[PDB]
Write a protein that binds this ligand. Structure first.
Ligand SMILES: [Cl-]
Ligand SMILES: [Cl-]
Ligand SMILES: [Cl-]
Ligand SMILES: [Cl-]
Ligand SMILES: [Cl-]
Ligand SMILES: [Cl-]
Ligand SMILES: [Cl-]
Ligand SMILES: [Cl-]
Ligand code: NA
Ligand SMILES: [Ru+3]
Length: 129
């Protein structure tokens, strides 16, 4: 599923992301934009052999199991394929663990490089949330 901007914002809010660990809703939508372009099916291989899955490009080295990432953990206790679903519940529950891990949203390199510090409220402008 390719979400619309406000559509994803509403979904994220419903699932308890707005101000989760103090990150406003615009932060999460901005991260999703640059990680996946709002595409639940997005996958991208990393240089280390792990792969990133779904709207928030969650990484098989720590977070999910994809069966092909040696020496890796599955801290969200989920198959990585569950992160590609039209229903974002698994992705959000797993993001909640990630953001709680100590470095906040800096875990998402695209967030640090493209969203951090910016006017992220622009990403929810116009949405009825
Ligand atoms: Cl957009
Ligand atoms: Cl915001
Ligand atoms: Cl891939
Ligand atoms: Cl594996
Ligand atoms: Cl599995
Ligand atoms: Cl959903
Ligand atoms: Cl990242
Ligand atoms: Cl980046
Ligand atoms: Na893994
Ligand atoms: Ru839902």
């Amino acid at each position: 599923k390719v979400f619309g901007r406000c559509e994803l914002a509403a979904a994220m809010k419903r699932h308890g992301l707005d101000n989760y660990r103090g990150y406003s809703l615009g932060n999460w939508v901005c991260a999703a934009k640059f990680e996946s372009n709002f595409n639940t099916q997005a996958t991208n291989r990393n240089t280390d052999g792990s792969t990133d899955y779904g709207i928030l490009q969650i990484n098989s080295r720590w977070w999910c199991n994809d069966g092909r990432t040696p020496g890796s953990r599955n801290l969200c206790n989920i198959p990585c394929s569950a992160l590609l679903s039209s229903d974002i519940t698994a992705s959000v529950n797993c993001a909640k663990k990630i953001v709680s891990d100590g470095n906040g949203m800096n875990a998402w390199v695209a967030w640090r490089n493209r969203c951090k510090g910016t006017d992220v409220q622009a990403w929810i402008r116009g949405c009825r949330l």
